[PDB]
């Protein structure tokens, strides 16, 4: 296979933005885009609770080559994405989330 480019995986190029890694609480609606970069084919999403039951996600059909993804934290912790395109693990996943900031106290952005 000297011709042609490196056929490895697409899943590779699935890359996330809009989730927030840090801020998202419980009991608030968590939504996202999932970019693909030239990638197609179908994104399954499943958050796993830190209690021991394995929840769904909510994503609908492909739309404007990308998808997005709805899911709302059931408990605190760290809940583990499960973010999986034909068949191939997409590179960094489960995507680990915080859900439950701790109000800190500590200045802001006002100058001063």
């Known amino acids: 296979g000297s011709s042609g480019s490196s056929g490895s995986d697409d899943a590779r190029r699935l890359t996330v933005t809009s989730l927030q890694e840090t801020g998202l609480k419980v009991n608030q609606p968590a939504s996202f885009a999932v970019q693909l ?3 197609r084919g179908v994104i399954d999403a499943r958050v796993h609770t830190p209690s021991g039951a394995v929840e769904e996600c909510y994503v609908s ?6 998808h997005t993804i ?3 934290p059931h408990e605190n912790g760290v809940h ?3 973010v999986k ?3 191939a693990h997409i590179p960094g996943s489960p995507f680990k989330i915080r859900v439950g900031e701790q109000s800190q106290a500590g200045s802001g952005p006002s100058s001063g």
């Open 80 to 82: 583990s994405i499960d």
């Open 70 to 72: 709805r899911f709302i």
């Open 37 to 39: 970069n030239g990638a």
């Open 61 to 66: 059909e492909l739309d404007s080559d990308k």
């Open 85 to 87: 395109f034909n068949g």
